[PDB]
């Protein structure tokens, strides 16, 4: 295979990652294993998020993942939520939550 992603068996563009690292003034030189490692990390995170996003879209009987789904997914998963704890999702909305003392007795 020609593509480095195929060599590493990855869907993301390792070449693009390598360019980015080199065009970002993060260090004088970039190793050859870092683009692969970083691309794998990015792929893994994207897959993890997409799993929950698709599951949420299913729960709402929808063929397309829309921002509401992305929000729901992230905010329901403790770790993902912590990673994006200071991030805002356009059209995200919020998890449905009402404080107990506000419920009638």
């Amino acid at each position: 295979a020609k593509t480095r992603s195929s060599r590493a068996g990855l869907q993301f563009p390792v070449g693009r990652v390598h360019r980015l690292l080199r065009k970002g003034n993060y260090a004088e030189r970039v190793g050859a294993g870092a683009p692969v490692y970083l691309a794998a990390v990015l792929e893994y995170l994207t897959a993890e998020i997409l799993e929950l996003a698709g599951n949420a879209a299913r729960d709402n009987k929808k063929t397309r993942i829309i921002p509401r789904h992305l929000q729901l997914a992230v905010r329901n998963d403790e770790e993902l939520n912590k990673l994006l704890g200071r991030v805002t999702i356009a059209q995200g909305g919020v998890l449905p939550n009402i404080q107990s003392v506000l419920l009638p007795k």
Partner: protein, 102 residues
């Protein structure tokens, strides 16, 4: 012979209905055009003769609404801690103090 009306809701019920209603959707709550006018005014005072990409205004409004919703959540938390049910200005100030905002 007259026309009689059935009944009247107890207070607070529609509050809860609204709460769930707006916690289910995501569409923006502040009306658009007043928001744009306010933003234009604020920028004007920072510098005159500026123009805006609509998308920029939309992003600004999204961030503003998100910030405000979180602020209200924290305010409600403070209100509850103060054994109350009506949020009151001092609750907002406490929230902003603890947040490290000024």
């Amino acid at each position: 012979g007259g026309v009689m009306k059935p009944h009247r809701y107890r207070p607070g019920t529609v509050a809860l209905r609204e709460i769930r209603r707006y916690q289910k959707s995501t569409e923006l709550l502040i009306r658009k055009l007043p928001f744009q006018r306010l933003v234009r005014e604020i920028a004007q005072d920072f510098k005159t003769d500026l123009r805006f990409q609509s998308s920029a205004v939309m992003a600004l409004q999204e961030a503003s609404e998100a910030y405000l919703v979180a602020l209200f959540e924290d305010t409600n938390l403070c209100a509850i801690h103060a054994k109350r049910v009506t949020i009151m200005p001092k609750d907002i100030q406490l929230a902003r103090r603890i947040r490290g905002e000024r």
